[PDB]
Design a protein around this ligand. Sequence first.
Ligand SMILES: [O-]
Ligand SMILES: [Zn+2]
Ligand SMILES: [Zn+2]
Length: 239
Amino acid sequence: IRPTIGQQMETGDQRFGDLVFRQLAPNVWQHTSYLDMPGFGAVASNGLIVRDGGRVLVVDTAWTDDQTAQILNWIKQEINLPVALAVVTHAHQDKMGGMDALHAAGIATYANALSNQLAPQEGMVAAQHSLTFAANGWVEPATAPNFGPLKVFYPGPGHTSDNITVGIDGTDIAFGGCLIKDSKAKSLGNLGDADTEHYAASARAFGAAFPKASMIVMSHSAPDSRAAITHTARMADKL
Ligand SMILES: [O-]
Ligand SMILES: [Zn+2]
Ligand SMILES: [Zn+2]
């Protein structure tokens, strides 16, 4: 009995090691990893895996190198194609905590230049390559070579000063990372590194950048429809 990963994922989300995987589209999966907070519930973070022909692309690490190695194990087991590159969406642990595992696997990594400046200070590892954004927020194409369907956008400072977002061309999906929370959320999570003045405008800019994305994928909520964007901006208004 040898079903494809797509065939297997019709049963629902799949637990794999300490992670959970969910198929969002025929070639797009959400990875979920968890940070144990002793005495409290574990903090979930989501990223993406995209099968782009004969290669795989990753958006965001897991919280740790080990969890990130578990992602790579899942990719080997279920997809059985090489991982070419990863884009990581700011210098917090949930997004860049596993850079060493990516680098050891020969994966080329990309982050906002600002994320690369901030990461080592925090005991993290910079990505190998730095993205630069035009004033309009779109990545300068020369700094994002061979990204396939990934369309990278800097919406402005919000959840952090360096937060970036990623649309997946040919799908209904845009990834807001930690900038966006779902339409039912009671809070924006930890705002300790947030730009409270600009957050709402940056959430709006993300929505405007990917107007055809009907599925909004987020780090700290399950996927939602576009109402998540204005809900997030409403929660962020006049912080
Ligand atoms: O985060
Ligand atoms: Zn963050
Ligand atoms: Zn986060």
